[model samples]
Each structure stands twice: as structure tokens, then as C-alpha cells.
Target: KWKWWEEERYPEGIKWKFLEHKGPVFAPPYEPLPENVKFYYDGKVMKLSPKAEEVATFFAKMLDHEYTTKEIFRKNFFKDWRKEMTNEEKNIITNLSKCDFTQMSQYFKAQTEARKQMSKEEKLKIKEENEKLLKEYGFCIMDNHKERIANFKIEPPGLFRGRGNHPKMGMLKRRIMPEDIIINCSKDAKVPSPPPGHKWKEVRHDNKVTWLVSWTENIQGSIKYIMLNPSSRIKGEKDWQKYETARRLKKCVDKIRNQYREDWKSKEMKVRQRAVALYFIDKLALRAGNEKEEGETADTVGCCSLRVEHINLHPELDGQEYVVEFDFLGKDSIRYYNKVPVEKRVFKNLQLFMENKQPEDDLFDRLNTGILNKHLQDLMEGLTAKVFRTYNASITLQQQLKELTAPDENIPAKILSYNRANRAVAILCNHQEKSMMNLQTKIDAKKEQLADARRDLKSAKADAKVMKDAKTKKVVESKKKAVQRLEEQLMKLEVQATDREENKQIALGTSKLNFLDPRITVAWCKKWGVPIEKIYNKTQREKFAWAIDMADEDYEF
Candidate 1:
């Protein structure tokens, strides 16, 4: 494997030396339904014009889907769909509620069932074509080798739904004509060829950005670019660049803190507003603000989304002199609610409400952090989200491990202690319930050892006075040692469970079992001077047959 990080970077100006690429695989033309499929436009079974029926066909196939039910879906689809409709067809099919396409959905069901039921001939052709398509479009050449393009295919036009609540829900995406594509390359001779007879809009050389193709998407009017997959050094450089910059922030945090501290004189309505907000930014490691357009998905934001109703200034709540009440969702509405006591200056200025602002207003009119971030950042070379007081958690992890384990403790005991520091915060997934039964099985199996451990020690303790031989005293001493070892063994296993529980519940996981310490028992055999035959349970015996033969007098440490 290449050590990609070993390569030195060029100056900030040139992103790449060259990009060898091709056109995106465009979506296939819409296949018309067989004429046997009937469409009912209001109680009448009318034949639709070819283009008109394709629009209805789009709606028809999706009749089973959820988008069609949205009133927003019907209205937006009707608005965009009408533009595609011919003049004669538009007048007659007035109500979307009246137009019916259920049989089309049913026919799709029949057609797919029949279509995939093909005899041998068509199967290879379909399989062969798909493989052929990938061979042509799947890879791009950039730098010295052929690198993968992440999404080589242009997205097929279809009904679009945004993820959160309702933003772009119930909308249609139009197809990409070759004319619509802007092919990019340093030289046109190496430019990706456009499809037959269809010409590209522009193939201009622009070295500034690293995308080989660009097209404006219809829904948000945002330009979508086709770039090489990150495995190609360019974006891998970026992935490393981001966290590397986050690490650089680790060094510069102090002076920036002092800079913002002085900004507390932080005068000007906006400056002081940003000054106080920066307190939350660095203090809580809160997100930079979000600037949203109207009517987007179940909206989510960080400090910017931090709205008025979600927080309140509590002058003396819970005996704190200056407190801020936060009761709102942040980042996927993860239900973050905290009451923090802030500085006196912050408390006095939280009321800077900026006037005529209510629930939806911004607390700091100019303080989204991105704008102020440029200054704090030109201070370094950075997401102002990097301005977290992580010295707290990082220090806790340090202090936690310091007190976590004893010098004599086993590796796992130290591991559990180290883990516990991460614990003091449980600060964070769900996993399979196998963790419970698997652990319970471990708890019981050592019962056999548990039984043996006690008998030797207790018997040795009570009968210590009765048995006078030095060998007897030595036996009792070994029994005492066995008791101490068993306690640590069980405690070690229990610490594993401690590591297991928080690990299982919150996510954070592993592979064990097939590869448990193979020679731990081999060493066990050597250390105690036990013969192989008795200790090795048959299956265990077979697995470690080599360990048995290989063991020399002093195999273990």
C-alpha cells in the first residue's frame, strides 16, 4: 500500500497537475408502458399524448410511494409537471386528484415480474451491458494513475425528497442533456467526448477548482460537480487537511481566547454580541450558526439555529449569579438541554436581544462565527467549531488514567481504568444483545475454576495448624497466593465486563474468541509445571497441540 501521507504538497495555488476524466453516464430515456396498460383520467379511460403520459407514468409508478400523498407533492408536481405538458393536454387534465394512474402501478408490477422472467439470452446482455458501462465510466485518470470516480453516473431524474422533515420533499428532478453538461479539462483534445451529435456547453480550462464536470441541479439551483473519488490524492489530501487543521487549532487556542477576552470591550453592538457568543462557541464547543433559506427540511442548526425560545437568561436561577437556560435540540434535534452559569458580562449582555427580535431572531446579528472565524483563523491558517475547550475532556482523560489503575494492576485493570476516564463523561450506538449472553457464559464457565480456587485456599487456611510439614506450609502459602490470583482474575474479568457494558450500550466495539491468547494455556502449563494431558480439554488440546510440543522449560515470562 502507498503511504499517501509521505508525499509532499505543492503550493496552495495549484490543486492538481492534471485530471484525465470522462462524461458522466447519463440516465436512460424513459421506457413507455405497454399500451395494454390503461390510465383513467377521471371516470374516463382516455389515451394520453406520449409526453403527457410519461409525466403521468412518473406519478403512476410512484403511486405506491409516500410522496404522492403529500399535498405539497401534488401542488409542486402539478406546477412543474404543467410546464412539461402540451397546450392541448393542459386544458383537459385540470385536477390532479381526478387523474388516476393505479393500473399503471399494477401493470408495472406485472411487467417487472414478466421482464425479469427472461430466458437465458437477455440476462447476459443486461449483465454484460452494466459491466461494460462501468468499464467505460467507473475510473478516471488523475496524477499518475487511474483513480476511481465516486459517483460516475449522473443521477437519474426522479421525484426528490430531502431527508429531514419536508424541505425538498415532493419534487421532481429533470434529466441531464449532453448540452447541459460543462465538460472540463486543461486541454480540449483530452476532454471527454460528448454523446453522438450532442455538444457540450463549455470545455474551458479552469485550474481553480478540481471537478471535471459541472451542471446546475434544478431543485436548489446549486451547481453539482463531478470530481474524482477521494482515494485519488486530491480529496484524500483534503480529508487529511481538515483534521490536521483541527490539530493545529490545538496549539493556538490560548491567544485566541485572550483576543476574544479583550473583545469583551468587544464594543459595537455586533462586536460585543459576537464576543459573548464566542464564549458559548469555545466554552461549549457549540456549532457555528446556520444561515437557512425559507421552508427547508425539519430545520436543524447549531449556535446559529440556537434560537431565542430555546434559551433564556436566568439572572439568579438555582443560586447562580448569571445563568443561561438552554432547552432545545441541537444537531439532529439530539435533545441537548443544559443550564450553564456564565460570566457576569455575558449575563448582562445576553439581553442585547438586538431589538424587535423574537423567537426566530439571531442573538448576535453578525456573529455566525464564520465571519469572526476568518480573523481568529487568519490568526492561524480553520471550522471555528475547532474552538472547543477540549483541554477539559483531554485533561480529564489524562487525570482519569492517572488515578484509574494501581501500579501492580493487570493490563486490563489499567485498560478499564483508562476506559473509565472516558466513562466519567459516558460523553458519547446500539449493538446486538449477544453482549449479555456472551458475557454471562464467561461468568459461568470460570465457575469450574472458581470451585477449585476456594477449596485449596480455605482448606490450607483451616488446616494450617494441623499440618506441621514445611511442605504443608508451602502448600498453604501457594493456596494463599492462588486466592489472591483468583481475586485478580475474577476482578480482571469483571473489569472486562465494565469495559463491555458501556461499550455495548453506547456502540464503540471488536473480534475476540477464535484468537484468544493461544499460548496463554501453553504458558499456563509451563508456569505451574502441569502436564499437558489433564489440563487440555480435548478440543483445547487439539488446538494447542503445537504449544504442548513447543514448550521448553522456561517458555513463559
Candidate 2:
């Protein structure tokens, strides 16, 4: 068990002392579907060539998925599928609707069902092969320690049904091969051998960059890389450094906030416009919003990228004064629709910004993330837009923990409080699951039990008065304690229900991993005498192991 964080670090901007690694383990070649598992086209049995069947296998495997029913999804696949099909087959199977993929669907479902039912020995044999594969190609030496490669295997061929309603949602993501990837390793190190005699696109000894393999995704043609796993020193240090930068923000955030507040009345339109947007981001926790390619990507509204169409101005709505209404899908096409009462000054600034613009026009015409972030950098070194999110979320967590934590609370209840603390940031940041029945049933059970205990306590008191016996008095006290215990547990249940139900739509992970500083959590657990294990499960504890071991209870931010 090596502690990478405790060890010495590289001087200057060196990411690694030198890198050595095997390339990504490509997903194995496609095996043709069994002879009995046949595909049908328009009510007739049809045979497919190996290349065509391989791609069609995805349709069969994911036929039950909801996205497969989408119009664009079906339409896009037909075109990609046509390219893979022969001229004879393409003309024959003209309509995508006419082609039935159920046979292929039944094939893999049954295949999966059969796979789950395999004997222990058969499963063991298969598992052993993966162990050997990991032993050989999963890890590489970086500096003095062996580092594991994250996502060592190439992505399996699959249909793209990305987040939100993407234009490329229904497109086919092509299966990757050795030739598509450029293998990178140290020139003197042992390079990974590709499958059989298959050649890689290129093998370059690039020590400066961290990736061991690189390829372009077919759908977006965006460059993708095979990088180190989260536990690797390369990743750990970056996480550590990010929080350090955010921790620096805490000391100066007060100064920054007041500056923006004062800037709302600045004479310059750009200053006032930029100031109000900063207020929105700092308070609302909206994203910085990079410019999206107009036709190429989904139009996501953020603080800087807000368009006139995305917002509605109201002098007063729903009894609220000077409200600014936002209605639009932001990043990942996540809808952000809210009517918030704002400061009169900020609202007036917004009115001026929105005054002469068309619905399609940008609300902040002079502002972009590049300009906003550049301005932010001038306020403080490294004071960028994301820092606003990080600062607000992190501070909100620490504040929630202070208010929610109680001395009488047990460890599990303390864990509950911390989660409540986490939920506060989630509600604030909008990082946007159920076992309600179980808790509700217990609550009802406790109520009935407490009622009986109260009834028994009354009876024992009456008996004590009538019989005048010390034994009856003891029984009365015992029943009273039982009633109190039941009531106590019932109160806990109600608290759980209130907190749990409030969190129905609140996503905790987005802020948990990225935004909220881990050192805050680490110090919180230590000061309250709570275990980090309660907050972070096995994999997460490992991921934030740097923060877990390093932060003292007295540590700030």
C-alpha cells in the first residue's frame, strides 16, 4: 500500500518523471452470431455477411432500449447500416421500418440468459482469462510506482444515445481497432504488441503528455485518450491541486463578492452587465457556459451564454417583486426553469441588457466565458468562473454541517446529518432513487408500538395507585421508558423521511466529486469523530485517499 501523496513530487510542470505503459487493450474481434440465431428482413429469413451482422448485433442487443425507438435514432442508423450493407442487400431492404431485428434481439437476450446460467467452473475459466489480461496489460510504471490505466479496453461498438436530445443521438459509434489508435510510450520502454500482425496507426514516444493511447471518436471526431485511473498519482495530484486552489478562494471570496455587488452600479454598460452575470453565477451556481457550435451542438444556456429567448422579464409575478425568470436547457440539455426575485438594481441592469435585443439574441452581447474568465483572473490570480461553483458549494457544505450536526446524534445519525449537509449543496448547485416504503413502514410500526407502550404505562400507573405495590411502580417506570424509546426512534424516522424525500430530485454526485472540496469533508469527519467510510464508499475513499489522510481536523476550508 503505497501512499503516492506522501512521496516527493516532480519539479516544475513535469506530470511524470517519465512514462512507461502498454497501449489500450482493444475489444476483441466480433464473433459471428450462431447459425440458429438468424436475422429477418420484412417477414422473411435473411442471411447477413460477417461485417454487416457485427454492426447489426448492436441493434439486436439494444432493441429493448428506449432510444432505439426514437425517430432520429432509427433514421441515423439506417444510413450508417446502409453503408455497411452490400448493394444487393441495401436495395432489397429499403425501409428501416420494414426490417425486423427481433431475431437478433432474441438471440442476445437468450445468449445473456444462457451466459448468466453458466456453471461455476465455466465462469471461473472466463474470469481467470481476464485476470491474466489485467496482470499483463492493465498497469504501467510511472516514476517509482506502478500506475493502473483507466479504461484500458477500447469502447465496445454501440449506438450513441447521449445525454439530452443530441443531434448525433441516433448515430452509430464505430468499433475501434488497433489501426485507429496511436500507441504512446517511452522510446526505451517495452511497447505493447498489437493483436497478431495488425498495425497501429502510429507509435510515438511522447513523454510530455499523459495518454498512452489516442484515437478520434467517429461521431464527433473528437480526440480521445487512454489515461491513468483515478487512483494514479497523476490523477490524485490534480485533484489535490484543484482543491488547494479552491481553498485559496475561501479567504478572498468575501472581497470578490463585495466587489461584484459594488460593480452593479458602475457607469460602464459592460461593467454593469458583467457584474450582474457574476452575481447570477456566484449566487445561482450556474455554469460559466462556453459558446456552443450553433448548428453542431445543443444550445445550452448558462450565465454567460444566456440568450434573450431563454429568459423572461417580469416587473412582478406571483406576488414577487422585480423577478427574473429563466427558462432554457443548459449544459447536457438539463432544463433550468426558475422564477427568482432579484435585487432591484440587478434586475434593472438585466432590463437594460435585454432592452434592445431580439428573442434569439444573446442577453450579454459583450460577454463570453473567455472575456468573463479573463476579467475574473484580474480580480484574483486563478479566480475563474468554476471557482464560483466550487466556492459556493464547498462553503455551503461546511455551513450545513455546522448547523445540521448535533452532539446527541449517534454515528449513523451523524452520517445522516452529513448527507443532509451534502444535500444542501446539491440543492444550491443543482447537480442535477427510492426506499421510502421501508422507512415508512418502520415509522408506522414505531407509532403503533409507542401507542401500546403509552397505554401500558398508563395501566401500570393505575395499577400502582390501586395496589399500592412497589412492583407496579417499577412496571410504570419501565413502560414509560419503553414509550420514550419508541418515540425517540419514531422522531428519527420522521427526520429521515423529511430529508430523504426532499432529496428525490437532488443529485449529490456532481457536487460531491467535482465541486465540493474533499478536504472540507475530511476535516468534517475528523472533527465530529465520524468515519470517512460513512460518507464515501469503497471506490470513493480510494479516489479521495489523498484528502482523507492529509487533512487535519483543524484544517480550514
Candidate 3:
């Protein structure tokens, strides 16, 4: 059997690399603006600038181009083939052509001062112009034929060829093909045809109640972007049902895990490893890491993505038990580091994977995510590896908080319990702070302001007591009110600081599921304890208005 990675086997392999090793260079072929694109801004329809118009036109023309085609819009192709430049500038362009334009565009602009870098007056003028351009280009949701329409089009950030860590320099302008235009109209909605004489794979009308827009990425091939209507019944129903199922399924998995731990004597190596990995998924709720796509940098992985070199066994990390310490960069360059106390059987299974293997060899070489998920499917219906994570994390938070909290506890204490629950889940999921410098500084600033407000309030209260005369008493009473206001403001600042720190590492989505319950977190504070104002910070209270005011039984967690 021949693998896709073989050198001479692939079509693009043997001859393609040497044939124009470094493709075209700078100064891309310019085209006029498209006739269809009209910018409506400042209450008037206007045409875009020559530069902006050219960019839009290039994309419109290249919309039918293949994403995998090399000549689409590479920096080398632009600088070498299109541009007429001297030897000195040519050397610079060649070097700059190596950078990835998609990732480095912002840094390139900052370094080169390309946006009319001159006097402060010029900078401010350009900034205003950029704002105007964005306002003209960006579109808001509108009602068209009783359907929500987000009708906006533009060139993706690519073809502005960059050099030397510059993202804009060497971007491959993805030629959007007819195959890439994935129309996801409702099954009952009108089936709009493509431009006359143009062909697509097929028009799909799947009204399965999933609010998602489909597209095709040349890299991943096909993808879906789901639209979530804010405060809608659908989102609310999903949130409740998701947590309820997770809570229900987690109890069964936890029992299985406990039984496996107690009866580990005769289990096979693969079985033991799978059990441990399943525990992590069910308890910690980690992503089931998959194989990396070809051509991407070598760094990231998940459970199924682990290679031998990623793990290290420490015998004496915390005394008796062996510690399985592993570090690997996962998706989006995020680091995944875990140091867990392992049972002897699990430790032995890992050692078996390491025996007679090279550093780069796969740790769980025989298994992949598809196989792992298949095993999970047998354990329970609709229970994939990811479901275990969702189930475990949500259930853990509910159980931990319910046990830790008291009915008579103050809002601050209840909030503390929430943080404690969130922290436990974060620890299990291996959530670590990438950097604490900014977070620490923010905590300090909040504290200082709070102290200053407390001091001011104290001074105002003290001043009021000094005025004893009946005529002066009226003025003293007014000063007392001022002191009370200051005290309230200081308390609010303190709550904000704590909430921010707790939310430093955990995602808002995760926090909403675990730490927040809109009803319980709000109601308890309102009834027997602190006010709802004290329980929720300003931003959270606003974001969760539906949860705070909606019927209590409507929510599950």
C-alpha cells in the first residue's frame, strides 16, 4: 500500500518542486473594480478608492480559481514576475517572500510604517480614512424577504505580498472556485441558481433545524459556521439539554472508571491506556486530538495525536506514585502540559509503548481517534470522546458547588464557591496561565482604587460626625449619603476584580456552563442573602439578562 506522504508517489512531488522553485515576485497585476460592488456609507452610495477597488476586483476575478493552485497570489509570483525593480529591492523582496502573509500582516504594517508614516497629522488622517473604509465595507444584519441576511463581500487578507516575518508579503491568494460556493438555503426556501451558465456540485437544502452556514476550505476541505441567535429559545434549550444529559451520562462513566481502578490486575495494556484516556475525557473534558494535516508545522496533537517523545515518566514527583508528565503543543499553538499520578498498570502500559521505539514514534501507534471513538460508541449510545469531557466538566461543577455551598452563605462566599468549582475543573482540564503579568497588574490596580475609595468614604463619614449643630446636621446628613455611595462603589470594584481573576484562564462558554446558573446564582443572592447586583459583575449581569429574568424552571443548571 502506498501512503500519501511518499516522495515519488504523489503527482506534485518529483518534478513540481524544481519547476519554478521560487515562484513569481512583487507588483501584482491590477484590475478595475467590480460593477456589482457599491459601498453605502455616510448616507450616500460611493465608489471605493483605486487601491481598495483593485483589491476587491482581484478577488472577484479570482473567485473561480482553485485554492490549491500555486499562481493564485504568492508573493514570489508577484515580486519576481509582475514587479519591475532594481537588484537591491529584488533581494529584499525574495527574503520577504518567505513569510506567511495570513499570520504576519499586522506585524509587517507596524514594522514598515507602510500606512503613510510621517507627521502625527498624517497618522491621524490615515486612521480616520481606515475607519471610514471599514464602516463602508462592514455590513450589519438586515431583513431580506423575511430572512436574516448578512450580505457583504470582500477580498480575504492574502495577496498584499510581504517579506521578512511580514504576513502581508507572501500570502497565497486562495482562488475561490465555483465548488467552494456552498449555498445552505432552507429546504423549503427558494432554490436560487448560480450565475447563468456557471456550475456547482449541487445545491443543498437541508432544513434539519441546525442554524449553520456551510462552506468549503481547501485546507480542511469542508466546514460549517453555526449562527447562534442571542437569547433565543434554541440556544436556551441547547444549553439546558446539553448540561442535563452530561450530568446524567457522567454518573455511569464515573462508576465504570471506579470499577476499572479497583479491578486493574488482569487488564490488557491497550485496555488500561484506553480506560485512563477515557477517564481524562470524562473527568477533564479534553479534546480528542486528531492527526495533523499535511504541510503544517510539526507541533500539535491530542490524545490520539500523541507521539512517544511527548511523554516523560517521573518516578518521584510526589513520593509513592509515578507521575506521567507530558507536554505538547496542540491546535492554534496552544500548549498542553499534564503531570498526573498514574496507577502502576497505566504506567506499565506507557512504558510498553516506549519500549524499542524511536523518540518521534507514535506513543499509541496502533490507535487513532476513529478507533477510540468507535470503542466509546459501544460503551454508550451517542457517547463520543468529546461528549465525555462536556459531561464530566459540567457534572463536576454542579456537584462540587452544590456540596460546597450553604443556603445561608453570603453572596461573596457563594461567589467564592463558584470560583472554587471553576478552579477544580480548570485544574482537571490542564488549563494553565500562559502569562500572569497583565492579570497580576490588573488585580493590583483594582485593589488600589478600592482602598482609595474606602479611605475617601471613611473621611466623609468622620467629617459628618464633627458637625453637631442642628443647622449643620442637614449638611452632615448629605455628607453621610455621599459616604454610602462611595462605599457601594468600592464593593463593586472588589467584586469585579475577583470575577476577572477567576475568568482569566477559563473560557466564557465553559464558565457559563459551570460557574454560572443565571437562576440559582442570581436567586439565592436576591432572596436569603446578598442582592443580585453583588452576585453578578456589570458585564456578566448584562450578558446574562435572559438567565437572570427568565422563569427558574426553564433552566436545568
Candidate 4:
């Protein structure tokens, strides 16, 4: 017999407790029973009763069949589940919106234990019988490439009745009719006739060999379930080549930005506007503004796609040439807001855009992403706006940290400076966070501790005037050093926070900078005495494994 302790113990001194506590349990709402609920079994319709567990088994088979055949419907499961539920149950399920599967596995396992009074042997017996039914009804991916096949349809997976928060809990799949078959019949073979009572749109098997499979989204756009053969040409590699290519493209983009900044005063309005937009792409790493689909509500609008009201310019701003305030939504409905001082010529170009256009008119009405990309491609073989962002972010990080790190500083002080450098980039890219509330309190406490150490050292030196003990004097000196070290650390953290807030818009390209050879950073740290942890996050340490654990002299970027 299995011991209770072996089964009950969980980590952190917790144990499982079974409860008879009942608040609510799931029951398919009291609806008039369907005239018939059928499932495909033994190549024909097999009727099933509406038991909760029986429905769970049917759904499990549906999932298993989809997984095996490499085709599944993403939409059919969502659609049919709503159809099966009663109004009250449907309201409850709908309110539980946005399927999050992370917690599902453990929840289902707990349900299995709730029913654990059923012996392992009994559970196995049920599993075997249900699996046999699945095999007889389920379909598999056809292996041959030459076989002429057509008419694909799939029955969707149902929900596990005992599992929490799953929408498709207990609905039976109806039988497949001959009319539902869409055949790609070949000219050589006569079109297969539909069932005696049914009809098909047309039959043509002459199409080239492709995976003939069934799925819930067959009639709709359910591309998620389809899988191409491994030998097909679309797989991507997991190498650093993409990073290097992005870097090279960035150099060309920078050159384009420089060319525009130099010629901003030219008489032509179109010439100046193109340059200003290029500058934004190079500096901000904005994506090429693509055309929007109907009813999609475009968020990823860019310079040409920018509406007239998206920007406001302050012409008389003091201490800055021109202040441009921008607020708009970008891809995924993320709000993008920035107020930056720009070159005088670029500000003038904005004025030109505003002069003749309404607030709803496109700012750069004559331009689109294709035109911009075509221009970039002319500058260098395969360059685009995104490459500039990646390249500049990485290179700027390397350069800034190299300048800011101090080799002679203690570990904490050096780490602070490294963070300061990272913050500068974050600011440049417009990465903003609300002020950290406890930061000042934490800094004040550190300062007070340092002051106490300073006082102790002063008292010890005065005591040396009377006792003249050599060891005592040495300890006093050490205390002074400790106080000095802490003051430096406090200063560094303050500077980092200040710089990070000042630069608020950090380009997403900082992601690439994290991958640069850490040895280059470590060497600077050694030369200046900067701490390694400040420069590299926990993840960066793992990614640059060769640099972190290696001897300081053995690595370079």
C-alpha cells in the first residue's frame, strides 16, 4: 500500500488536504437534450450520452487527433463552445475571457486527484477503452507525397470537464456529411461521388501534392494549425548573423541622417522633409510606416502616415532650437509620446506639412514605407530603418559605458556608473518609468550610515592623540576609507537615476547591445575598477558565458 506521507508532502512544509467543501460544481445547464449527439467512430456515426467525463474523453481524443495530424482549428473551438453553452453558462465563460494556459496543467492534475478514490487500475481501464474509441475515430497525417488526396475536415478538441476555466467543457461533435467534403479530384481519376443524399461544390484532385488535412477553421482563415514539411524553405536559424547584418545596415543609415542634418537649409521643402524623416528613423529606430488594412484601426503610423494633429511644435522655446511634442498610438495600441528639441530646418518642414493640411490629413501624404525602404535599399544593398536602431543602440551602449566607467572605483561605485551609462541610452530612446518612491529614502539611509562611520573615525583619531596605539590608528584609517567608499556609491546611484529620467526614450535596440563582448566592458572595468554586475544583468551573464568566467585578458569585443 502507498504511504500517505509519500503522496502528501509538498515543499516549504506544506501538505495536501482533501476537502468536502462544496460551493459550486459544474453541470451543463438544464436544457432540452439535443435530439442526438453523434461522434465519428468506426467510420460512421456513433451516438454518445451527455456525461461530463464522457465529454472530457471525447475532447481529449479531439486534441490528440489534432496534435498527431499536425492540423488543428484555432477558431472552431472558440465558435462551437459558445454555441453549446446555455445563456448563463455562456455569460460566465465569456466574462472569463482571454485564455491563459500557463495555470491549466496543474489545475487539471488537481482535478485528477479529486477523483483519486478511483483506483489506478480502474483509471487505466477507462483510459484503454476510451483510447480504443479514439483510434477508430481519429485521423493521422498522411506520409506519402504522391498520393492524390482531397476533402479535408477536422473535428475540434473539447474541454476537460474537471479542468477549471476551460470554455469547451462538454459538447459532442456532429457526424461529417458527404456534402461537407471539398475534393481536389484529378482529371485521370473520375471525381468521387458525394454520399447519395448530399452534393459538393466541385471536385478537382489535379492540384499539386499538399497536406490534405481536416481542421475547424477549414472554411475560415485558420492558418495556425497547418505545418509545412521540414524540408520546406521557411525555417530560420539561431545564430548571431542577423545581429551583425543589422549593425552594417545601421552605418549606412547614420550616414543618411548626417547628410540630411548637413543640408537642412536647402530651398526645397520635399528635400528637407525626407532628410528629417530619415533622421528620426536612424535616431529613434522607428519602423517603416506600412499601409493599414480596412477596419484595423492603424496604430503603427509613421512620418508619412502621421496625421496633422499628431505633432505640435513650439517655435519660440528658449535654450532649445525647436521643441516638437508628439503623441500617437503605435503597433499593438501602445501609446508613444515624446517632446524633443529638433534642428531648426526639421521644424520648418513640419510647419510646411501643417500649412495646407487639415488635422486629419496625412502629414507626409506623398510617402509610404515602400518608398522609404526602396530609398534605403539604394543607399546600401539590403538596408532598412530597423537595422539602424539595432546598430546604433548597441554601438552607443559600448561607447558610452567605455567613457563612463572608472577602473579605480570600488565594485559598488563602478556598478552604479555602469547603470548610469545604461540609463543615458534609455533616456535617448525615450524609455520612461514613473519615479521610484523609495529611492530618496534608501539613499538618505546610506548617507547616514556613512556619516556615522566618518564620526567613528574622527573620534578614533582624537583618541590616538592620548593613547598613541598604532593598531588603533590603523583601524581608524580603515574606517575612514569605508566612509569614503560608501559616499562614492551613493553618488553613483543618484547620477544613474538622474540620467535615466532625463533621457526617458530608450530605443528597443539596447537589446542587441547586451550581446557585445563583455570582455571589452570587463577590461574597462578592470582599468577603471568598475563592478561587472552593474554592466551585465543576470541574463547577460548567461548569454556572454565566454566573457564572464574567462580571464580578463582573454576576451575583447
TM-score of each: 0.68, 0.90, 0.61, 0.52
Q: In model 2, what lDDT does residue 43 have? A: 80
Task: Using TM-score as the measure, name the better of candidate 1 and candidate 2.
Answer: 2
How does candidate 3 score on lDDT? 0.51
In order, the Cα lDDT scores of the candidates are: 0.65, 0.81, 0.51, 0.50
Higher-lDDT candidate of 1 and 2: 2
The residue-by-residue lDDT of candidate 4 on 1-557, one tens digit each, is: 11211232234322111111101111223232233433333334433334322432334344433321221233334455456555554554442124322232344455567787687887899899756644432222222122111212234334423122222223235433344434442344334444456565445342333322222432222321222222211111111334556656645655766766885666765655666677777656565667665332324566556777888889876566688887876554456787768777778766877887787887776667776777777877766665666566656666776686564655665566565665555545543244666666877778777777767777666767687769767777787678667777677576646554654454434443433434556666555544566666675554444344443633333
For candidate 3, write residues 1-557 as lDDT tens digits. 11112222223212111100000011234554345445332334545455444443343333334431344344433543224334443454343233223212233344357554577887888789756644543322211212111222322434433222232233334544445455444444444454457554556544343333344443334453434333323344445445455555656776666765653443555665566655555544557877866433335677777778888997778675887887877655567777877777767766767788887887776667787778777766656776666655555665676687787644455666566555656556654344555645765675565566555555445655676656645655555565556544445345445555665654455455443345545544444546666645675664455556652423344
TM-score winner between candidates 2 and 3: 2
Candidate 3 segments exceeding 4 Å error: 1-179, 186-188, 192-201, 208-213, 224-239, 262-269, 282-284, 296-298, 318-320, 399-424, 427-480, 495-510, 513-557
Provide the global lDDT of candidate 2 against the true structure.
Answer: 0.81
Q: How do the candidates rank by lDDT, highest first?
A: 2, 1, 3, 4
* Order by TM-score, highest first: 2, 1, 3, 4
lDDT of 1: 0.65
Which of the numbered candidates is closest to the native, going by highest TM-score? Answer: 2
Q: Report lDDT (Cα) of residue 373, candidate 1.
A: 73
